[PDB]
Structures are given as C-alpha cells and as structure tokens.
mmCIF file of C-alpha atoms (C1' of nucleotides) and ligand atoms in Angstrom:
data_model
loop_
_atom_site.group_PDB
_atom_site.id
_atom_site.type_symbol
_atom_site.label_atom_id
_atom_site.label_comp_id
_atom_site.label_asym_id
_atom_site.label_seq_id
_atom_site.Cartn_x
_atom_site.Cartn_y
_atom_site.Cartn_z
ATOM 1 C CA UNK A 497 -7.994 -33.825 14.518
ATOM 2 C CA UNK A 498 -6.000 -30.642 13.862
ATOM 3 C CA UNK A 499 -6.981 -27.380 12.160
ATOM 4 C CA UNK A 500 -4.771 -26.234 9.286
ATOM 5 C CA UNK A 501 -4.685 -22.832 7.592
ATOM 6 C CA UNK A 502 -2.469 -20.788 5.268
ATOM 7 C CA UNK A 503 -2.175 -17.023 5.705
ATOM 8 C CA UNK A 504 0.307 -15.827 3.074
ATOM 9 C CA UNK A 505 2.352 -17.143 0.149
ATOM 10 C CA UNK A 506 5.381 -15.165 -1.029
ATOM 11 C CA UNK A 507 7.722 -15.655 -3.986
ATOM 12 C CA UNK A 508 11.104 -14.759 -2.511
ATOM 13 C CA UNK A 509 14.082 -14.475 -4.849
ATOM 14 C CA UNK A 510 17.857 -14.924 -4.758
ATOM 15 C CA UNK A 511 20.399 -13.553 -7.233
ATOM 16 C CA UNK A 512 23.619 -15.081 -8.561
ATOM 17 C CA UNK A 513 26.036 -14.128 -11.315
ATOM 18 C CA UNK A 514 23.865 -16.077 -13.749
ATOM 19 C CA UNK A 515 20.594 -14.401 -12.824
ATOM 20 C CA UNK A 516 17.496 -14.895 -10.673
ATOM 21 C CA UNK A 517 16.845 -17.828 -8.347
ATOM 22 C CA UNK A 518 13.277 -18.013 -7.050
ATOM 23 C CA UNK A 519 12.136 -19.480 -3.743
ATOM 24 C CA UNK A 520 8.880 -19.954 -1.860
ATOM 25 C CA UNK A 521 8.056 -19.245 1.778
ATOM 26 C CA UNK A 522 4.879 -20.002 3.692
ATOM 27 C CA UNK A 523 3.508 -19.469 7.190
ATOM 28 C CA UNK A 524 0.851 -21.757 8.665
ATOM 29 C CA UNK A 525 -0.906 -22.115 12.011
ATOM 30 C CA UNK A 526 -1.934 -25.430 13.585
ATOM 31 C CA UNK A 527 -4.368 -25.934 16.446
ATOM 32 C CA UNK A 528 -6.608 -28.544 18.022
ATOM 33 C CA UNK A 529 -9.518 -26.147 18.595
ATOM 34 C CA UNK A 530 -9.350 -26.652 22.379
ATOM 35 C CA UNK A 531 -6.663 -24.103 23.268
ATOM 36 C CA UNK A 532 -3.436 -25.571 21.896
ATOM 37 C CA UNK A 533 -1.673 -23.270 19.431
ATOM 38 C CA UNK A 534 1.187 -23.954 17.048
ATOM 39 C CA UNK A 535 2.791 -21.618 14.527
ATOM 40 C CA UNK A 536 5.020 -22.620 11.635
ATOM 41 C CA UNK A 537 7.135 -20.680 9.158
ATOM 42 C CA UNK A 538 8.453 -22.753 6.285
ATOM 43 C CA UNK A 539 10.563 -22.052 3.204
ATOM 44 C CA UNK A 540 11.131 -24.052 0.014
ATOM 45 C CA UNK A 541 11.215 -23.679 -3.769
ATOM 46 C CA UNK A 542 7.707 -25.093 -4.287
ATOM 47 C CA UNK A 543 4.397 -24.813 -2.444
ATOM 48 C CA UNK A 544 4.121 -28.483 -1.317
ATOM 49 C CA UNK A 545 7.585 -28.554 0.237
ATOM 50 C CA UNK A 546 6.944 -25.115 1.739
ATOM 51 C CA UNK A 547 3.683 -26.165 3.394
ATOM 52 C CA UNK A 548 5.255 -29.421 4.590
ATOM 53 C CA UNK A 549 8.080 -27.479 6.253
ATOM 54 C CA UNK A 550 5.575 -25.083 7.801
ATOM 55 C CA UNK A 551 3.439 -27.918 9.161
ATOM 56 C CA UNK A 552 6.505 -29.651 10.609
ATOM 57 C CA UNK A 553 7.714 -26.467 12.311
ATOM 58 C CA UNK A 554 4.223 -25.790 13.673
ATOM 59 C CA UNK A 555 4.041 -29.336 15.038
ATOM 60 C CA UNK A 556 7.395 -28.804 16.750
ATOM 61 C CA UNK A 557 6.353 -25.443 18.258
ATOM 62 C CA UNK A 558 3.175 -25.538 20.372
ATOM 63 C CA UNK A 559 1.625 -23.239 22.967
ATOM 64 C CA UNK A 560 -1.332 -23.650 25.319
ATOM 65 C CA UNK A 561 -4.213 -21.174 25.660
ATOM 66 C CA UNK A 562 -5.771 -20.903 29.169
ATOM 67 C CA UNK A 563 -9.287 -19.876 28.138
ATOM 68 C CA UNK A 564 -12.265 -19.665 30.504
ATOM 69 C CA UNK A 565 -14.979 -21.928 29.129
ATOM 70 C CA UNK A 566 -15.247 -20.265 25.725
ATOM 71 C CA UNK A 567 -13.557 -16.835 25.942
ATOM 72 C CA UNK A 568 -10.378 -15.136 27.156
ATOM 73 C CA UNK A 569 -9.897 -14.304 30.841
ATOM 74 C CA UNK A 570 -8.840 -10.639 30.807
ATOM 75 C CA UNK A 571 -7.903 -8.017 28.206
ATOM 76 C CA UNK A 572 -4.278 -8.256 27.103
ATOM 77 C CA UNK A 573 -2.108 -5.598 25.451
ATOM 78 C CA UNK A 574 0.311 -7.672 23.388
ATOM 79 C CA UNK A 575 3.258 -5.469 22.449
ATOM 80 C CA UNK A 576 5.739 -7.507 20.427
ATOM 81 C CA UNK A 577 7.289 -7.797 16.965
ATOM 82 C CA UNK A 578 6.541 -4.412 15.335
ATOM 83 C CA UNK A 579 2.750 -4.529 15.597
ATOM 84 C CA UNK A 580 0.408 -3.783 18.481
ATOM 85 C CA UNK A 581 -2.381 -6.350 18.837
ATOM 86 C CA UNK A 582 -4.902 -5.798 21.633
ATOM 87 C CA UNK A 583 -7.082 -8.723 22.709
ATOM 88 C CA UNK A 584 -9.973 -8.869 25.172
ATOM 89 C CA UNK A 585 -12.903 -11.232 25.743
ATOM 90 C CA UNK A 586 -16.532 -10.437 25.056
ATOM 91 C CA UNK A 587 -20.140 -11.606 25.522
ATOM 92 C CA UNK A 588 -20.710 -15.180 24.298
ATOM 93 C CA UNK A 589 -21.655 -15.485 20.641
ATOM 94 C CA UNK A 590 -20.214 -12.108 19.637
ATOM 95 C CA UNK A 591 -17.569 -13.878 17.550
ATOM 96 C CA UNK A 592 -13.815 -13.775 17.071
ATOM 97 C CA UNK A 593 -13.368 -10.268 15.660
ATOM 98 C CA UNK A 594 -9.822 -9.948 14.321
ATOM 99 C CA UNK A 595 -7.792 -9.401 11.171
ATOM 100 C CA UNK A 596 -6.579 -12.061 8.780
ATOM 101 C CA UNK A 597 -3.595 -13.626 10.525
ATOM 102 C CA UNK A 598 -5.155 -13.028 13.940
ATOM 103 C CA UNK A 599 -8.379 -14.575 12.640
ATOM 104 C CA UNK A 600 -6.539 -17.691 11.491
ATOM 105 C CA UNK A 601 -4.494 -18.140 14.666
ATOM 106 C CA UNK A 602 -7.474 -17.576 16.971
ATOM 107 C CA UNK A 603 -9.723 -19.920 14.987
ATOM 108 C CA UNK A 604 -7.006 -22.574 15.163
ATOM 109 C CA UNK A 605 -6.835 -21.866 18.905
ATOM 110 C CA UNK A 606 -10.566 -22.571 19.060
ATOM 111 C CA UNK A 607 -11.740 -19.425 20.854
ATOM 112 C CA UNK A 608 -15.205 -18.279 19.802
ATOM 113 C CA UNK A 609 -15.475 -14.701 21.136
ATOM 114 C CA UNK A 610 -12.697 -12.094 21.069
ATOM 115 C CA UNK A 611 -12.285 -8.394 20.273
ATOM 116 C CA UNK A 612 -9.043 -7.540 18.487
ATOM 117 C CA UNK A 613 -7.326 -4.624 16.787
ATOM 118 C CA UNK A 614 -3.992 -4.310 14.990
ATOM 119 C CA UNK A 615 -2.441 -0.881 15.428
ATOM 120 C CA UNK A 616 0.505 -0.945 13.014
ATOM 121 C CA UNK A 617 2.694 -3.002 10.690
ATOM 122 C CA UNK A 618 -0.139 -5.076 9.247
ATOM 123 C CA UNK A 619 2.412 -7.649 8.050
ATOM 124 C CA UNK A 620 1.128 -11.154 8.747
ATOM 125 C CA UNK A 621 4.327 -12.471 10.351
ATOM 126 C CA UNK A 622 4.611 -9.599 12.825
ATOM 127 C CA UNK A 623 0.889 -9.770 13.580
ATOM 128 C CA UNK A 624 1.143 -13.502 14.331
ATOM 129 C CA UNK A 625 4.154 -12.924 16.587
ATOM 130 C CA UNK A 626 2.262 -10.204 18.463
ATOM 131 C CA UNK A 627 -0.805 -12.414 18.955
ATOM 132 C CA UNK A 628 1.350 -15.306 20.185
ATOM 133 C CA UNK A 629 3.026 -12.964 22.668
ATOM 134 C CA UNK A 630 -0.408 -11.689 23.722
ATOM 135 C CA UNK A 631 -1.521 -15.237 24.509
ATOM 136 C CA UNK A 632 1.754 -15.774 26.381
ATOM 137 C CA UNK A 633 1.026 -12.658 28.467
ATOM 138 C CA UNK A 634 -2.308 -14.154 29.582
ATOM 139 C CA UNK A 635 -2.665 -15.011 33.267
ATOM 140 C CA UNK A 636 -5.078 -17.513 34.842
ATOM 141 C CA UNK A 637 -7.031 -16.698 38.028
ATOM 142 C CA UNK A 638 -6.173 -19.852 40.000
ATOM 143 C CA UNK A 639 -2.383 -19.571 39.912
ATOM 144 C CA UNK A 640 -2.650 -15.782 40.031
ATOM 145 C CA UNK A 641 -4.326 -16.275 43.411
ATOM 146 C CA UNK A 642 -1.675 -18.868 44.273
ATOM 147 C CA UNK A 643 1.096 -16.353 43.526
ATOM 148 C CA UNK A 644 -0.678 -13.653 45.527
ATOM 149 C CA UNK A 645 -1.248 -16.047 48.445
ATOM 150 C CA UNK A 646 -4.939 -15.112 48.675
ATOM 151 C CA UNK A 647 -7.943 -17.399 48.101
ATOM 152 C CA UNK A 648 -10.048 -17.356 44.949
ATOM 153 C CA UNK A 649 -13.091 -15.572 46.388
ATOM 154 C CA UNK A 650 -10.855 -12.756 47.659
ATOM 155 C CA UNK A 651 -9.165 -12.297 44.256
ATOM 156 C CA UNK A 652 -11.553 -13.092 41.399
ATOM 157 C CA UNK A 653 -14.983 -11.523 40.798
ATOM 158 C CA UNK A 654 -18.168 -13.375 41.668
ATOM 159 C CA UNK A 655 -19.382 -12.955 38.088
ATOM 160 C CA UNK A 656 -16.405 -14.802 36.639
ATOM 161 C CA UNK A 657 -16.758 -17.381 39.417
ATOM 162 C CA UNK A 658 -20.336 -17.932 38.222
ATOM 163 C CA UNK A 659 -19.144 -18.179 34.615
ATOM 164 C CA UNK A 660 -16.423 -20.677 35.575
ATOM 165 C CA UNK A 661 -18.906 -22.785 37.547
ATOM 166 C CA UNK A 662 -21.314 -22.808 34.596
ATOM 167 C CA UNK A 663 -18.477 -23.783 32.242
ATOM 168 C CA UNK A 664 -17.413 -26.596 34.583
ATOM 169 C CA UNK A 665 -20.998 -27.867 34.801
ATOM 170 C CA UNK A 666 -21.324 -27.789 31.005
ATOM 171 C CA UNK A 667 -18.018 -29.643 30.614
ATOM 172 C CA UNK A 668 -19.134 -32.275 33.130
ATOM 173 C CA UNK A 669 -22.446 -32.706 31.297
ATOM 174 C CA UNK A 670 -20.643 -33.045 27.957
ATOM 175 C CA UNK A 671 -18.253 -35.618 29.434
ATOM 176 C CA UNK A 672 -21.193 -37.583 30.851
ATOM 177 C CA UNK A 673 -22.967 -37.509 27.480
ATOM 178 C CA UNK A 674 -19.814 -38.657 25.695
ATOM 179 C CA UNK A 675 -19.257 -41.490 28.166
ATOM 180 C CA UNK A 676 -22.893 -42.609 27.881
ATOM 181 C "C1'" U B 91 -23.356 -4.720 38.379
ATOM 182 C "C1'" U B 92 -24.325 -5.018 32.710
ATOM 183 C "C1'" U B 93 -23.304 -3.751 26.777
ATOM 184 C "C1'" G B 94 -20.237 -3.285 22.862
ATOM 185 C "C1'" G B 95 -13.431 -2.802 18.467
ATOM 186 C "C1'" A B 96 -11.515 -7.168 11.743
ATOM 187 C "C1'" G B 97 -8.620 -5.752 7.229
ATOM 188 C "C1'" A B 98 -6.450 -6.064 2.107
ATOM 189 C "C1'" G B 99 -3.445 -4.158 -2.419
ATOM 190 C "C1'" U B 100 0.609 -0.920 -3.616
ATOM 191 C "C1'" U B 101 8.350 1.289 -2.980
ATOM 192 C "C1'" U B 102 12.764 -3.645 -3.415
ATOM 193 C "C1'" G B 103 16.834 -8.739 -6.670
ATOM 194 C "C1'" A B 104 14.526 -9.992 -1.882
ATOM 195 C "C1'" U B 105 12.426 -8.914 2.837
ATOM 196 C "C1'" C B 106 11.867 -5.736 7.996
ATOM 197 C "C1'" C B 107 10.446 -0.663 9.663
ATOM 198 C "C1'" U B 108 8.468 4.102 8.911
ATOM 199 C "C1'" G B 109 5.448 6.571 5.777
ATOM 200 C "C1'" G B 110 1.706 7.887 1.696
ATOM 201 C "C1'" C B 111 -2.412 6.496 -1.561
ATOM 202 C "C1'" U B 112 -6.488 3.335 -2.788
ATOM 203 C "C1'" C B 113 -10.631 -0.466 -1.861
ATOM 204 C "C1'" A B 114 -14.373 -3.595 0.792
ATOM 205 C "C1'" G B 115 -19.085 -0.811 5.296
ATOM 206 C "C1'" G B 116 -23.292 2.739 6.635
ATOM 207 C "C1'" A B 117 -25.808 7.436 5.436
ATOM 208 C "C1'" C B 118 -27.967 11.940 1.618
ATOM 209 C "C1'" G B 119 -33.485 17.324 1.141
ATOM 210 C "C1'" A B 120 -29.210 14.201 -4.051
ATOM 211 C "C1'" A B 121 -28.526 13.860 -9.977
ATOM 212 C "C1'" C B 122 -27.580 11.796 -14.475
ATOM 213 C "C1'" G B 123 -27.821 6.618 -17.748
ATOM 214 C "C1'" C B 124 -30.982 2.001 -18.900
ATOM 215 C "C1'" U B 125 -35.298 -0.188 -17.272
ATOM 216 C "C1'" G B 126 -40.275 0.064 -15.128
ATOM 217 C "C1'" G B 127 -46.453 -2.736 -12.405
ATOM 218 C "C1'" C B 128 -49.776 -1.528 -8.475
ATOM 219 C "C1'" G B 129 -51.051 -0.209 -3.410
ATOM 220 C "C1'" G B 130 -49.890 2.160 1.825
ATOM 221 C "C1'" C B 131 -46.728 5.206 4.514
ATOM 222 C "C1'" G B 132 -42.682 10.004 4.208
ATOM 223 C "C1'" U B 133 -40.234 13.584 1.520
ATOM 224 C "C1'" G B 134 -39.849 17.970 -2.169
ATOM 225 C "C1'" C B 135 -35.965 24.702 -4.637
ATOM 226 C "C1'" U B 136 -29.840 23.025 -0.543
ATOM 227 C "C1'" U B 137 -28.122 27.914 -5.899
ATOM 228 C "C1'" A B 138 -30.820 33.756 -7.374
ATOM 229 C "C1'" A B 139 -32.633 37.233 0.685
ATOM 230 C "C1'" C B 140 -33.511 37.685 -7.945
ATOM 231 C "C1'" A B 141 -38.026 40.664 -10.434
ATOM 232 C "C1'" C B 142 -42.414 39.086 -10.161
ATOM 233 C "C1'" A B 143 -48.765 38.527 -15.125
ATOM 234 C "C1'" U B 144 -53.968 37.191 -12.435
ATOM 235 C "C1'" G B 145 -57.099 35.121 -8.381
ATOM 236 C "C1'" C B 146 -57.073 33.531 -3.147
ATOM 237 C "C1'" A B 147 -54.288 33.539 2.402
ATOM 238 C "C1'" A B 148 -58.428 38.593 8.122
ATOM 239 C "C1'" G B 149 -62.821 39.330 9.572
ATOM 240 C "C1'" U B 150 -67.306 39.693 13.148
ATOM 241 C "C1'" C B 151 -71.750 42.731 15.759
ATOM 242 C "C1'" G B 152 -79.551 45.869 14.214
ATOM 243 C "C1'" A B 153 -79.475 42.545 21.232
ATOM 244 C "C1'" A B 154 -75.014 50.230 20.018
ATOM 245 C "C1'" C B 155 -76.646 54.500 16.831
ATOM 246 C "C1'" G B 156 -78.826 57.048 12.420
ATOM 247 C "C1'" G B 157 -80.995 55.004 8.535
ATOM 248 C "C1'" A B 158 -83.308 51.718 4.156
ATOM 249 C "C1'" A B 159 -79.490 51.165 -1.347
ATOM 250 C "C1'" A B 160 -80.560 45.926 -2.573
ATOM 251 C "C1'" G B 161 -84.255 41.254 -0.723
ATOM 252 C "C1'" G B 162 -89.636 39.931 2.688
ATOM 253 C "C1'" C B 163 -94.447 41.126 4.480
ATOM 254 C "C1'" C B 164 -98.678 44.415 5.035
ATOM 255 C "C1'" C B 165 -101.817 48.963 3.030
HETATM 256 MG MG1 MG C 1030 5.364 0.494 23.621
HETATM 257 MG MG1 MG C 1031 0.233 0.969 11.260
HETATM 258 MG MG1 MG C 1032 -2.518 -1.707 6.960
HETATM 259 MG MG1 MG C 1033 -25.045 -4.275 23.358
HETATM 260 MG MG1 MG C 1034 4.023 -0.316 -5.716
HETATM 261 MG MG1 MG C 1035 10.943 2.710 0.166
HETATM 262 MG MG1 MG C 1036 7.840 -4.734 -6.912
HETATM 263 MG MG1 MG C 1037 -46.793 4.647 -3.671
HETATM 264 MG MG1 MG C 1038 -47.234 11.975 0.186
HETATM 265 MG MG1 MG C 1039 -53.436 40.150 -4.938
HETATM 266 MG MG1 MG C 1040 -68.520 43.416 15.142
#
RNA sequence: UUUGGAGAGUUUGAUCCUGGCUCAGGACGAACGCUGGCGGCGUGCUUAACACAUGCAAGUCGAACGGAAAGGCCC
C-alpha cells in the first residue's frame, strides 16, 4: 500500500522550423505512510506516460524519515534549491501545517503534526527539493548520542524520553493486537 | 517545565531566479441593494468644537429670626 499524489501539471513546449511541439511534465510523490519518502519528476507528451514516468522515478528514488512516534524530532532549517522551508514538530493532533507541495510530500511521508513555512520561490519543484533536504538534515537522538560518545540520558531530554517510551509502548500494543 | 507558523494565479517558444500585483482568513461605532417573523442580551452622530424654537437636568431648614400672603383650628 503506497500513497500517490500529483502536485503540478505543466504544458512545456519545444520549437522547430515547422512550428510548436508540445510536451507534458509531471512531478509526483510516493510514500508508504510510515516514514519512507520517494519523489519523482517525469516528462512525456501525454499525462498517462508522464505520470508513469514520475511513478517509476519515485519508486527508484526513496528516502527514510526518522520520526519519533508521530512527529519530527527537532526543528530543521532546510536551506536548499532556491526556497527556504522551515520544519519543526508540534503538539499531537495539531496537524501537518504546510503549503501545497510540502503538504503532499509530508502526507505521503505519513507524519501527522508539523509546522512549516516557505519563505521564497513558491515553485513546487524547488519547495519539494527543500523539504527533501530538510528531512535529510534531520538527526536522530540515539546515533547522535553514539557520535557524541555520551549516553542517552545525558544527551536527550527526559520529556522526549517519556514520549519515546510511550510511543514504544503503543507500538508494542499495536503489534500485539495485530498478532492476536 | 508547558503552548502555539499553510498558500494559489499572473512576465516567456519553454522553464529557473529576482521582483510587482491580486485572491482565499478574521475584525468595524459602518452604509447602500433585495428580502424579512418573534423573543433576550449590547450598541447608536466617527463629519459641522455649526446656530440653536419650547419644557425639564440643583435644592434643603419655623427645632435660627421677623412675620402671616395663600391653606387649618378656635372666638
Ligand atoms: Mg542562506
Ligand atoms: Mg519569496
Ligand atoms: Mg508565492
Ligand atoms: Mg495553545
Ligand atoms: Mg502574466
Ligand atoms: Mg520577466
Ligand atoms: Mg504566457
Ligand atoms: Mg431583539
Ligand atoms: Mg437595548
Ligand atoms: Mg431653558
Ligand atoms: Mg436650609
């Protein structure tokens, strides 16, 4: 089960000595809803071929989201492409607050609570690149502590330890219910 | 040690950037246009600090005095 979405459809054109040659380009985002993200950019002369190319490229290119239970770990300032997209977690149930392309990519990621803002070049392609880079910039507390050579309690806050323990207990309960 | 950030259209044969405009949101001591049933609770000259017909919005003491004009009683 994968989540599919389309963000923008553009009628690109090419010129020859005879006249105008039209073409179609599409960008799609694929995700499993658990924290696995794939982006695809596909070009054709017709929408079905375009979306097929986009889906294939997205299937080729994947990326994993290290989310804590339901939300993001820490605020991230994703500076890439030409747009500035700033992501940070929030209180559970607040919702994934983001623009169009960011909305699509985060919903395909499966996150449920995020605060986002795009600060320039509202173009969908650049926004998607900036969000992907923002997720790449994300760091996870366990291997952050491993890199720093200091144990978890001496690195990460007790509140996020409590949240992680609650998330682990909920995941264990869900696994038990699914097995039974 | 806890609470809360959305964008989209629009320059080009085509796109990327910058950059400008516009729209989706809430609010008013508001008004005009159609329509219109009641009840409760608020609000009411933002301009002309312009002139204002009439009547109201500042009175109380005989246990302060002299008195009795108008009411009472008694000859
Ligand atoms: Mg910078
Ligand atoms: Mg901008
Ligand atoms: Mg914009
Ligand atoms: Mg709050
Ligand atoms: Mg234009
Ligand atoms: Mg130009
Ligand atoms: Mg044009
Ligand atoms: Mg009424
Ligand atoms: Mg009233
Ligand atoms: Mg008078
Ligand atoms: Mg007096």
